Amino acid sequence: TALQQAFDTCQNNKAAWLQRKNELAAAEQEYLRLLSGEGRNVSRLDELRNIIEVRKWQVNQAAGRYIRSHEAVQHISIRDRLNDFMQQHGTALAAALAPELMGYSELTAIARNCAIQRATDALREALLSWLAKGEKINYSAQDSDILTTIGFRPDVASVDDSREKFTPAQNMIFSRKSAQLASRQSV
Amino acid sequence: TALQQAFDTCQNNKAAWLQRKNELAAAEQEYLRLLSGEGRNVSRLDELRNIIEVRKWQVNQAAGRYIRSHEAVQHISIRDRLNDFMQQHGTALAAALAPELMGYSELTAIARNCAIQRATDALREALLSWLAKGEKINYSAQDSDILTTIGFRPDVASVDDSREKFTPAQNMIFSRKSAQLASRQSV
Numbered sequence: 327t328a329l330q331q332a333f334d335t336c337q338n339n340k341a342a343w344l345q346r347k348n349e350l351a352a353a354e355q356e357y358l359r360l361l362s363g364e365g366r367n368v369s370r371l372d373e374l375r376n377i378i379e380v381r382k383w384q385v386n387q388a389a390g391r392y393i394r395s396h397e398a399v400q401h402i403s404i405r406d407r408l409n410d411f412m413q414q415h416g417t418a419l420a421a422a423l424a425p426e427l428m429g430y431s432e433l434t435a436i437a438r439n440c441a442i443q444r445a446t447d448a449l450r451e452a453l454l455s456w457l458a459k460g461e462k463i464n465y466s467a468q469d470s471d472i473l474t475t476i477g478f479r480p481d482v483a484s485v486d487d488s489r490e491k492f493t494p495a496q497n498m499i500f501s502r503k504s505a506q507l508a509s510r511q512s513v
Numbered sequence: 514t515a516l517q518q519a520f521d522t523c524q525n526n527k528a529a530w531l532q533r534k535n536e537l538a539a540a541e542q543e544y545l546r547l548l549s550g551e552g553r554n555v556s557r558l559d560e561l562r563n564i565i566e567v568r569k570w571q572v573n574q575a576a577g578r579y580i581r582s583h584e585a586v587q588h589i590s591i592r593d594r595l596n597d598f599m600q601q602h603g604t605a606l607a608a609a610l611a612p613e614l615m616g617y618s619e620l621t622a623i624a625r626n627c628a629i630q631r632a633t634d635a636l637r638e639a640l641l642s643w644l645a646k647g648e649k650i651n652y653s654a655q656d657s658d659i660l661t662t663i664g665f666r667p668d669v670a671s672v673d674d675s676r677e678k679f680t681p682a683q684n685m686i687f688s689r690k691s692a693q694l695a696s697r698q699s700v
């Protein structure tokens with residue numbers, strides 16, 4: 327399913343994000359070791375300084391991509407579970423909304439928009455009243471394992487990491503440097 | 514119930530509106546009979562001209578009041594039937610919306626607004642997809658007799674009748690003249 331793929335991608339993206347944070351930390355650590363020593367490796371320091379800049383960008387990109395993949399999983403589940411819900415109870419729901427919705431398949435564009443907006447306001451009010459009961463809400467059983475596994479929201483750390491904005495021109499430079507970093511043989 | 518009262522009021526208001534339209538027509542008819550005759554009852558004509566102006570205002574007011582009472586019946590039924598719906602299926606609906614709604618009773622004001630808006634967008638999308646099936650929508654069985662009796666929408670005649678706007682100052686004058694018209698003994 328699309329949901330399963332979306333979950334595999336989210337899990338992959340979260341790992342990539344944490345991997346980048348590890349790599350950055352490893353570079354920061356080597357840099358600091360050199361700053362703390364007696365030597366003065368001008369070129370190694372300069373190269374590490376460049377690497378650190380690249381890793382920060384990678385952390386930022388990975389964090390954003392992870393957040394979007396996380397939201398994608400939830401978005402797909404909601405859509406799909408709501409479709410199943412309407413399959414079971416659409417008739418009763420529409421019937422309750424009949425004074426707004428009856429004759430929908432015959433309405434003009436302008437009429438359909440009004441009808442949907444008003445039906446939507448009524449639904450919102452009903453949802454709000456039900457929510458006020460304070461009943462605890464669990465995930466749909468069908469998607470509970472996946473939704474539980476991914477967590478309710480991405481950690482704020484990923485939001486902090488992706489806050490910085492990079493232009494397309496910057497992404498061009500950094501994506502080039504990333505590829506260069508990826509083909510480096512350590513020696 | 515509030516719905517039963519609202520229906521009694523709608524039925525009353527529709528009758529009042531048609532009654533006013535009859536009264537106006539009766540005055541217009543007497544006026545025309547006089548215009549078509551040989552006589553020249555200056556004062557009766559002038560009084561009829563005044564009466565006709567008052568009846569037009571009454572038709573306008575009654576029409577508006579009828580439309581609002583009709584919408585009130587539908588508004589109450591939708592609210593009530595949706596409440597019953599949530600009573601039966603709220604848990605499943607909320608569960609399907611869990612990635613948006615879970616933890617709602619704990620959210621800040623800003624968070625609650627976002628959560629409701631997003632849950633509401635998802636609902637709208639689900640409703641739209643279900644509607645695209647083109648299944649015919651009937652009234653909830655509980656309110657079907659009342660909703661059928663009142664009709665889906667007020668006749669456009671009532672919209673035409675209430676289109677004209679009257680200021681509070683005009684309503685003051687006309688409401689006075691209406692009362693005067695009501696205490697007239699015909700002679």
Ligand SMILES: [Hg+2]
Nearest residue numbers: 336337340476
């Ligand atoms: Hg994930």
Ligand SMILES: [Hg+2]
Nearest residue numbers: 523524527663
């Ligand atoms: Hg009515």
